[PDB]
Every structure is written in structure tokens, then in C-alpha cells.
Amino acid sequence: WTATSGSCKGRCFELQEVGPPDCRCDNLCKSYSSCCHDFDELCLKTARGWECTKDRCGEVRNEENACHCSEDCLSRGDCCTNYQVVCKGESHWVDDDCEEIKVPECPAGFVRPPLIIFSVDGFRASYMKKGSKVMPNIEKLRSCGTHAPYMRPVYPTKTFPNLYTLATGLYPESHGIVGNSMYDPVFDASFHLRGREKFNHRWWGGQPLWITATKQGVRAGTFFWSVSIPHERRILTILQWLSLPDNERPSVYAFYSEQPDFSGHKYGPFGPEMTNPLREIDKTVGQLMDGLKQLRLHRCVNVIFVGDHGMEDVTCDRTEFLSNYLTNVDDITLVPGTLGRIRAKSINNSKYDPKTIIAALTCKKPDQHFKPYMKQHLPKRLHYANNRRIEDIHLLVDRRWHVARKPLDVYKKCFFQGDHGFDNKVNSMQTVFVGYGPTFKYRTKVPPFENIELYNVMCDLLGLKPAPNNGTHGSLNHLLRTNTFRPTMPDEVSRPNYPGIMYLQSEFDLGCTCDDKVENKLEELNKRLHTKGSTKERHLLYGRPAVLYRTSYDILYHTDFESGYSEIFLMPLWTSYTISKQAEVSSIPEHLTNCVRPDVRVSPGFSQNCLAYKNDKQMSYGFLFPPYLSSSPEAKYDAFLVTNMVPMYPAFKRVWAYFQRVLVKKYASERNGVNVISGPIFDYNYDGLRDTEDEIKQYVEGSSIPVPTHYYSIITSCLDFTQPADKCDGPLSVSSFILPHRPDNDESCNSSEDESKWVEELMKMHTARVRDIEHLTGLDFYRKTSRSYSEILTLKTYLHTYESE
Ligand SMILES: *[C@@H]1O[C@H](CO)[C@@H](O[C@@H]2O[C@H](CO)[C@@H](O[C@@H]3O[C@H](CO[C@H]4O[C@H](CO)[C@@H](O)[C@H](O[C@H]5O[C@H](CO)[C@@H](O)[C@H](O)[C@@H]5O[C@H]5O[C@H](CO)[C@@H](O)[C@H](O)[C@@H]5O)[C@@H]4O)[C@@H](O)[C@H](O[C@H]4O[C@H](CO)[C@@H](O)[C@H](O)[C@@H]4O[C@H]4O[C@H](CO)[C@@H](O)[C@H](O)[C@@H]4O)[C@@H]3O)[C@H](O)[C@H]2NC(C)=O)[C@H](O)[C@H]1NC(C)=O
Ligand SMILES: Cc1nnn(Cc2cc(C(F)(F)F)ccc2/C=C/C(=O)N2C[C@@H]3CN(C(=O)c4ccc(S(N)(=O)=O)cc4F)C[C@H]3C2)n1
Ligand SMILES: [Ca+2]
Numbered sequence: 001w002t003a004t005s006g007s008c009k010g011r012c013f014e015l016q017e018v019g020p021p022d023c024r025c026d027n028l029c030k031s032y033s034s035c036c037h038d039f040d041e042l043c044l045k046t047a048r049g050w051e052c053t054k055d056r057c058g059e060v061r062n063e064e065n066a067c068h069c070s071e072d073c074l075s076r077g078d079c080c081t082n083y084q085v086v087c088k089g090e091s092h093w094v095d096d097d098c099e100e101i102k103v104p105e106c107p108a109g110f111v112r113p114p115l116i117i118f119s120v121d122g123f124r125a126s127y128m129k130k131g132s133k134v135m136p137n138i139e140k141l142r143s144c145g146t147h148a149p150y151m152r153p154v155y156p157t158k159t160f161p162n163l164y165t166l167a168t169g170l171y172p173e174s175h176g177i178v179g180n181s182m183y184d185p186v187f188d189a190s191f192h193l194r195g196r197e198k199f200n201h202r203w204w205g206g207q208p209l210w211i212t213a214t215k216q217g218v219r220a221g222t223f224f225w226s227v228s229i230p231h232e233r234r235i236l237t238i239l240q241w242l243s244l245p246d247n248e249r250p251s252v253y254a255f256y257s258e259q260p261d262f263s264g265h266k267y268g269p270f271g272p273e274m275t276n277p278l279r280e281i282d283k284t285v286g287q288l289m290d291g292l293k294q295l296r297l298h299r300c301v302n303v304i305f306v307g308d309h310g311m312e313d314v315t316c317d318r319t320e321f322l323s324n325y326l327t328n329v330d331d332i333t334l335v336p337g338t339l340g341r342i343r344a345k346s347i348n349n350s351k352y353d354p355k356t357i358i359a360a361l362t363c364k365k366p367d368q369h370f371k372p373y374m375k376q377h378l379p380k381r382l383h384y385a386n387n388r389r390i391e392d393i394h395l396l397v398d399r400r401w402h403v404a405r406k407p408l409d410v411y412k413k414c415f416f417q418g419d420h421g422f423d424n425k426v427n428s429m430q431t432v433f434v435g436y437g438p439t440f441k442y443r444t445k446v447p448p449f450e451n452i453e454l455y456n457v458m459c460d461l462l463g464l465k466p467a468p469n470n471g472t473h474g475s476l477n478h479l480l481r482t483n484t485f486r487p488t489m490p491d492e493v494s495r496p497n498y499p500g501i502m503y504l505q506s507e508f509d510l511g512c513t514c515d516d517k518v519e520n521k522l523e524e525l526n527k528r529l530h531t532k533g534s535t536k537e538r539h540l541l542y543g544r545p546a547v548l549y550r551t552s553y554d555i556l557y558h559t560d561f562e563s564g565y566s567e568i569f570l571m572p573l574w575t576s577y578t579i580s581k582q583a584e585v586s587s588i589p590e591h592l593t594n595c596v597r598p599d600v601r602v603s604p605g606f607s608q609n610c611l612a613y614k615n616d617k618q619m620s621y622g623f624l625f626p627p628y629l630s631s632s633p634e635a636k637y638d639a640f641l642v643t644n645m646v647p648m649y650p651a652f653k654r655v656w657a658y659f660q661r662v663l664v665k666k667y668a669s670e671r672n673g674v675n676v677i678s679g680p681i682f683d684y685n686y687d688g689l690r691d692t693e694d695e696i697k698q699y700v701e702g703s704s705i706p707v708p709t710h711y712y713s714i715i716t717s718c719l720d721f722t723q724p725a726d727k728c729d730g731p732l733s734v735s736s737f738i739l740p741h742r743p744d745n746d747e748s749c750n751s752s753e754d755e756s757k758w759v760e761e762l763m764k765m766h767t768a769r770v771r772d773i774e775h776l777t778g779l780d781f782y783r784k785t786s787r788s789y790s791e792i793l794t795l796k797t798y799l800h801t802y803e804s805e
């Protein structure tokens with residue numbers, strides 16, 4: 001109940017929200033059906049429209065008008081945004097040359113430049129180039145300010161997850177808004193776009209920017225707008241708040257537009273009907289900038305123009321139906337559309353089996369336009385599994401397609417020509433970023449970055465300490481003229497041991513054999529120097545990784561590679577090696593095929609054994625440094641050390657062997673040498689973080705050798721590819737992957753074919769940032785380079801996406 005008979009007199013768009021049943025006058029009252037009776041009359045005035053005209057100049061103030069053109073309007077802060085243009089011969093902001101804003105030029109009483117976030121729903125990245133003729137105000141912000149060619153949204157590329165990610169710096173799995181539609185089984189409650197459940201505070205985790213600001217003494221405008229408040233009114237409201245007295249005036253504001261998304265759904269991303277929505281958005285920006293200029297705030301405010309996701313072509317005919325695959329289709333609940341999430345219709349049905357559902361959906365039609373996954377098997381780059389609101393079974397849908405349960409769903413719900421929600425690497429899902437103001441750089445283009453990073457920067461813009469989040473703070477310092485955040489590298493927690501030769505061959509009873517009993521003073525000092533680290537500067541180019549947790553490990557040096565060997569996990573945490581452009585691939589010689597050699601630096605007690613692998617009918621082994629790339633027949637013996645061995649399913653060995661035999665050499669030839677760091681990852685609880693030993697769910701049968709869930713590689717070279725990787729004077733280039741360590745290749749529908757037809761495609765799917773690997777291993781890479789730390793942070797957040805232009 002709301003006692004709707006209080007009044008909004010003097011209260012219009014109040015910043016503090018009042019408690020039921022006292023009636024509300026805030027920008028969300030409409031959404032709750034709680035506005036006072038006179039809200040429309042007093043707060044949503046429309047009389048005479050939104051622009052001054054020649055005859056309205058110097059009028060007698062009429063309080064009924066939507067905005068004002070009387071002499072006193074500037075001091076009242078409620079002029080139409082074109083007042084000075086029409087009535088005082090001023091130029092529109094867009095018609096002024098741009099001029100570097102070196103320092104904030106603010107009215108007296110401003111403690112810090114205000115931040116205005118101008119957010120646009122569905123604004124695809126290519127609209128900046130493709131709509132440029134019709135968006136002069138936006139183009140001026142873009143060319144005069146700082147801009148990225150695009151900004152990567154989070155998955156799923158829907159509105160609710162992405163706007164809340166912008167607000168919090170968190171992945172959807174951590175903030176809890178994991179789709180536009182959700183069932184939380186602990187609450188037994190559903191979140192929907194239409195309706196009231198979504199207003200309950202229990203859905204919304206982390207700490208959004210407006211709360212971070214308020215907790216630290218920085219006042220915030222209310223971020224959310226009721227759909228029926230027109231855009232012109234939202235802008236006028238912001239401009240009115242900017243005219244408040246110093247003690248009342250917010251420092252951070254958001255505008256939100258439902259366009260161009262609303263139209264993109266109806267007409268597709270480039271429908272001819274899309275020109276008008278873009279024009280209209282540009283006019284809104286024009287009104288804000290003209291309004292700021294009137295208040296002498298146009299060289300004081302930092303403006304961020306940002307989208308939540310892009311828009312793809314999708315029609316009703318491009319729908320796959322689960323009824324074409326599943327006999328039991330009525331025992332499931334599907335969250336449908338541009339992703340799928342499946343659970344049991346009833347938790348009382350004991351005959352429901354996710355294993356048989358996955359199998360019935362796997363590689364069943366030649367051109368199948370979705371791929372099923374257990375959520376823990378989704379590419380790690382999506383960070384989309386550690387939340388009870390995410391269903392165990394997930395369908396990754398091809399761009400341009402929909403999934404639905406039954407045909408009746410689609411025609412008893414062609415309406416739409418656009419949609420979004422697909423994998424966040426998809427080019428059509430990319431969105432925009434422009435920053436303009438005293439704190440942003442002047443006429444600067446920056447590389448593409450992920451929207452998880454912006455919370456930190458918005459905190460920096462407002463002098464706030466960010467709540468803990470998934471950004472890497474400092475990785476976007478290159479956007480900023482000042483207020484940069486200068487982090488220190490994390491402190492190493494565990495130092496390595498450097499073991500020498502301490503064990504005799506005969507102390508090892510591992511059930512391993514090697515054909516190697518084949519016998520010089522020139523070449524004996526040589527192998528000794530290699531074991532003491534004499535080639536370490538060739539294979540460990542950026543320093544050894546730092547171990548950021550408590551553990552026992554050894555550094556092992558070799559001619560061709562260096563490793564950090566874990567005594568707890570009985571394998572390397574990392575293995576580092578450089579392959580020059582000139583390097584030769586050799587084969588594993590016949591006598592060495594099943595060779596595993598004891599490592600005399602490492603106790604039998606801290607070693608793997610061959611017998612465990614023989615006994616484990618499911619599990620085989622591979623090597624982290626590939627024997628194929630040994631520098632010499634003598635150096636090849638090192639690659640067969642039991643300390644270079646890791647557990648591998650035979651199906652995974654197909655993948656790994658092709659990467660090591662073919663792909664590494666290929667990249668070295670293309671990139672002018674590469675440095676490779678490879679290793680295992682253990683993430684049995686799918687939280688994106690390194691497991692402790694007591695989290696491991698699988699061991700090689702009858703041993704304490706833990707089985708990795710994934711294998712990573714980080715492949716680094718010179719950005720200037722005219723310089724070899726080992727003699728690089730400037731910025732670096734990286735690509736990485738986190739491959740799932742799976743006992744089958746069901747993920748790859750063409751896997752019966754030659755590895756040259758499917759392996760590289762799999763690797764591309766599981767592309768990763770270095771930072772993803774850091775979270776998953778507790779390691780910190782690139783500790784010793786000549787480069788600035790912020791530059792290295794940017795490098796660690798880089799994702800190689802394998803999408804064309
Ligand atoms: C992305 O960045 C984020 C933010 O930094 C990273 O997320 C953090 O990860 C930490 C490690 O997993 C985690 O720390 C835990 O905090 C627990 C206290 O939690 C509450 O308080 C915080 C602070 O206010 C709050 O943010 C939390 O909010 C979460 O949960 C609510 C539900 O109430 C949601 O509304 C909200 O969306 C958010 O959900 C997410 O996090 C939880 C886990 O916390 C997930 O389950 C959800 O799916 C969702 O993703 C909380 O309200 C604290 O209890 C934990 O301590 C246990 O574990 C340690 C290990 O050190 C152990 O020593 C302790 O004894 C303790 O164990 C005991 O409890 C166990 C569980 O019941 C039990 O098994 C044991 O036997 C013990 O008795 C832990 O310290 C932190 O909360 C989150 N924060 C957020 C916001 O998500 C994230 O890791 C980054 N991602 C990547 C890939 O890097
Ligand atoms: C969600 C959410 N989380 N946090 N916010 C507040 C917010 C943050 C930021 C920013 F960038 F600064 F973080 C900027 C602006 C804001 C403020 C935003 C705001 O007033 N809204 C966003 C809501 C979305 N909405 C819909 O009905 C809707 C649902 C789905 C789709 S779809 N098909 O595209 O998926 C489109 C839609 F329009 C009601 C809008 C009112 N909204
Ligand atoms: Ca949206």
C-alpha cells in the first residue's frame with residue numbers, strides 16, 4: 001500500500017528514497033507504482049516542448065513550461081539546453097573546435113570534477129564508424145577524447161548482466177545477475193525483466209559504484225530511470241542536480257538510453273530504420289553538452305559514453321528446437337534464446353539424467369547451431385559457472401541463431417530481426433567506449449579492453465577506493481591524464497629450492513625404464529653448466545614467475561627449458577622455454593618411445609611413478625617441454641625426465657601432441673621466435689581460482705598424482721616482429737590458452753579427422769588472458785622486463801580473440 005496523497009511540491013527527482021507508505025517523487029517511483037498524485041503535473045512538465053525559440057527569449061517565467069528561456073533561468077539552472085544558443089548568440093558545443101582540457105576548469109565550490117556516465121543500450125562498436133555521418137556530437141567526443149575501437153562486454157551479452165558488471169567490476173557469476181532471467185534454488189525464487197522480484201536486494205551482490213561513492217562521502221545521482229521518463233527530462237534533471245548547492249550536489253551521475261537496442265531488436269543491427277535512433281541519441285548528447293556549456297561545466301565534467309553490448313542479425317527461422325533432439329522434452333525447463341540453460345522441470349523426477357541429455361544434444365546434426373556443455377567445461381575466459389543460479393547444462397548458441405524447447409514457443413510467444421546474448425568474443429557483440437574530460441587523455445586511441453575494468457577507472461575518476469573486483473587496477477592507466485593508480489607487484493610468498501644431484505638411480509623404484517646407458521671432459525663441464533642455469537637467460541626471458549601462496553617447490557634447470565617443480569603436486573607448476581625462428585622439429589627416436597628417466601635432483605618420494613600410469617587404464621602421460629623441440633640428441637634425454645611428466649588422457653594427448661609438434665614451431669616461424677610457459681591447472685570447484693590439495697577430485701589410479709582439469713600455455717614474442725623474441729627492445733605480444741583436460745573430444749564434432757582440421761579451432765575457443773591463468777595457478781608472470789608495470793598489466797589482460805576485422 002502507498003498513501004499516494006502526499007505531494008511532490010519542491011521534491012521532484014529527490015535523491016533520497018522515502019519509506020512506504022509515504023509517497024515517492026524519485027526517478028524510480030513510476031516503476032513501483034508509488035509516485036505522489038501530482039508527480040506527472042509537477043515533475044514531468046512538457047508544455048511548449050524542449051527547445052527555446054526566438055520569441056521565447058526573455059519571456060516571463062511560466063512554471064508550467066518543460067524548460068525555460070526567461071532571464072533568470074541560468075541562476076535557477078532550468079533553462080532549455082539551447083537557451084544561450086537561440087537567445088544569447090552562443091554556438092552549440094559541437095560547432096566549437098576542440099581544445100585540449102589540460103586541467104579541470106570548474107566553478108568555485110566544486111571539490112572534484114563530476115563524472116557523468118552516458119550509457120546506451122545495444123550500441124554496437126561498428127556504429128561509431130558506420131553511423132558517423134549522423135552522429136556529430138558523439139564523433140566529436142570520440143575524436144577529441146580518449147576512445148577504444150571497441151569494448152568487450154561480459155557473457156552473457158545481455159543488458160542486466162552487463163550494466164551491473166559496469167557498475168561493480170565483477171563477473172556475473174560473482175555479482176549474481178547471471179542473465180536477464182534467473183531461478184535461485186536457495187531462495188526458490190525467480191528473477192524476471194517484467195515484475196517485482198528483481199527489486200529485492202538479495203539478487204544484487206558486490207558493491208556498485210553509487211554505493212562505493214556514498215560509503216566514502218561522495219554523493220551520487222540515482223542511476224536507474226523509469227522507462228516512461230523521456231530522455232530530454234533525464235538530461236534536464238541531471239543538469240538541475242548539477243546546479244545544487246555544494247553540500248547537496250552529486251559528483252557522479254548516470255544517463256541511460258533504451259536505444260539503439262529497442263529498435264535493433266525490431267529491425268536488425270543495420271536495418272534502414274536504425275539511422276533515426278542513432279540521430280536521436282546524438283541529439284541527446286548534444287543537449288547534455290550544450291547544457292554543460294551553459295553551466296560552464298563543459299571543461300570540468302568527465303563524460304563516459306559507453307554501451308552494454310552490441311546486436312546481431314537473428315530471425316525466427318534460425319531457431320533450433322530441443323524437441324528435434326530430445327524424446328523427454330517435457331521433463332526439462334529451458335532458458336531459451338541466444339544461450340540455453342537447462343534444468344529438470346521437477347526435482348521430484350528421479351529419472352532425469354543430465355548425462356543423457358548432454359549426449360542427446362552432442363554433434364547430432366551436421367551443421368548443428370549450438371553446442372552443449374556442463375558449465376564447468378565452458379571456456380574459462382567466460383567465467384560463467386561459479387553461481388547456483390547458473391544451470392549445470394549450458395548451450396552455447398552460434399551467432400545469428402536461437403535455441404528453443406518446442407516450435408510452439410516461437411510462434412505462440414516473425415517479430416524480431418536482431419538479438420544479442422552470444423559469446424562475448426563475437427564481433428557483433430562488441431560495444432563502445434569514449435571518455436572525454438580533464439582526467440581523460442586528449443585525442444588518444446587505446447587498445448580494446450573489457451568492461452570489467454571500468455569500475456576501477458570510475459573509482460579513480462572520483463578518488464574512491466574500489467571494492468574488491470575482477471578488474472586489474474592499473475591496466476587502464478593509459479586512458480588517463482592524471483589520477484593514475486600505481487600498484488606494486490605482489491610479494492612472492494614461497495621461495496624456491498635449487499636442488500643439486502642428491503639421489504642415485506637405484507634409489508628409484510618407479511617402474512620406469514629408459515634405454516639410455518650410453519657413455520668426455522669438454523662436454524661434461526657443458527651439461528653441468530646447463531644444470532646450474534647457464535642457458536636460463538635464453539629460456540626464462542621475463543624472470544621466473546613468483547609463487548603467491550605457501551608451498552614447497554624446486555627450480556630445475558636444463559639445456560632447453562627451466563621448470564618450477566611442485567613437491568606437493570608432483571609435477572611442474574610451470575615450464576618455460578624459448579623456440580627461435582630457426583629451431584628444428586625432430587621426432588622422438590624409437591629407442592626412447594616409452595622412456596621415463598628418474599631425476600637425481602628430486603627424491604623418489606616427491607616423484608611420479610610409471611606403474612601408476614600402467615595400472616590406470618584411463619590415464620596416460622605427456623611432457624610439458626616437448627621432446628620434439630630438443631636442441632640436440634643429447635639434450636633430448638632431459639625431456640624424458642619424470643619431473644617433466646604430467647597426466648594426460650589419451651584423447652587429450654592428440655590435442656597436446658599437435659600443439660607441441662606442429663603449432664609451436666608454426667608460431668615461432670610467424671612471430672620470429674616465441675617464449676612458451678606451460679603448466680597444469682586444478683579447478684575442481686570451477687571458481688576460476690587455484691585449488692588447494694584438499695580440493696582435488698581425481699588422482700592417477702592408486703597414487704597421489706593429482707589430475708589437472710586444464711593445461712595452459714602463454715606464448716610471448718616481440719610486438720615488433722622484426723626483432724627475435726629473445727632480443728626484444730620494446731613492447732611484448734602475447735597469446736594464451738587454457739585447454740580443458742578431457743577424456744574425450746566430444747566438444748570437437750570433427751575430431752575423427754586429422755588434428756590439422758580441428759585442434760587449432762579448439763585452442764582458439766579456449767583462448768585466455770594471462771591474468772586468467774594467474775588466478776588459476778597463484779603465479780605472477782612477467783616479473784622482470786624493461787617495461788612499465790602498467791604496460792605489463794595491460795598485456796596480462798589482453799585476449800587474443802581470433803575474430804577477423
Ligand atoms: C572476482 O572478484 C571477486 C571479488 O573479489 C572474487 O570473489 C570473492 O572471492 C573470495 C574467495 O572465493 C570470497 O571470499 C569468501 O567470503 C566469504 C564471506 O562472503 C560474504 O561477504 C562478502 C563481503 O561483503 C560478500 O561479497 C559475499 O557476497 C557473495 O555471496 C552472496 C550470497 O550471500 C551474493 O549475494 C554475492 O553475489 C556474492 O556471491 C559470490 O561469492 C560466493 C562466495 O563468497 C559464491 O558462493 C557465489 O556463487 C557468488 O559467486 C558474501 O555475502 C567467506 O565466508 C569465505 O570464507 C571461507 O573460505 C575460506 C578460504 O580462505 C576459509 O578459510 C574460511 O574458513 C571460510 O570457510 C568456511 O565456509 C565454507 C563455505 O560455507 C565451508 O566450506 C568451510 O568448511 C568453512 O567453515 C571466503 O573468504 C568473496 O566473498 C568473493 N566476493 C564476491 C563479491 O564474489 C572472485 O574470486 C573474482 N573472480 C576471479 C575469477 O578472480
Ligand atoms: C541492470 C543494471 N545494473 N546497474 N544498473 C544501473 C545503471 C548502471 C550504469 C553504469 F554503467 F554506470 F554502470 C548505467 C546506467 C544504469 C541504469 C540503467 C537503467 O536506468 N535501466 C536499465 C534497465 C534495463 N531495462 C529493461 O527493461 C531492459 C531489459 C533487457 C534489455 S535487452 N533485450 O537489451 O537484454 C533491454 C532493456 F531496456 C529497464 C532499464 C532501466 N542497471
Ligand atoms: Ca542491453
Ligand SMILES: [Ca+2]
Pocket residue numbers: 682683684685686687688689690691
Ligand atoms: Ca578452484
Ligand SMILES: [Cl-]
Pocket residue numbers: 156158178179180181182335
Ligand atoms: Cl538470460
Ligand SMILES: [K+]
Pocket residue numbers: 613614615616617618619620
Ligand atoms: K595408462
Ligand code: NA
Pocket residue numbers: 745746747748749750751752
Ligand atoms: Na568428437
Ligand SMILES: [Zn+2]
Pocket residue numbers: 122159261262265420
Ligand atoms: Zn536487447
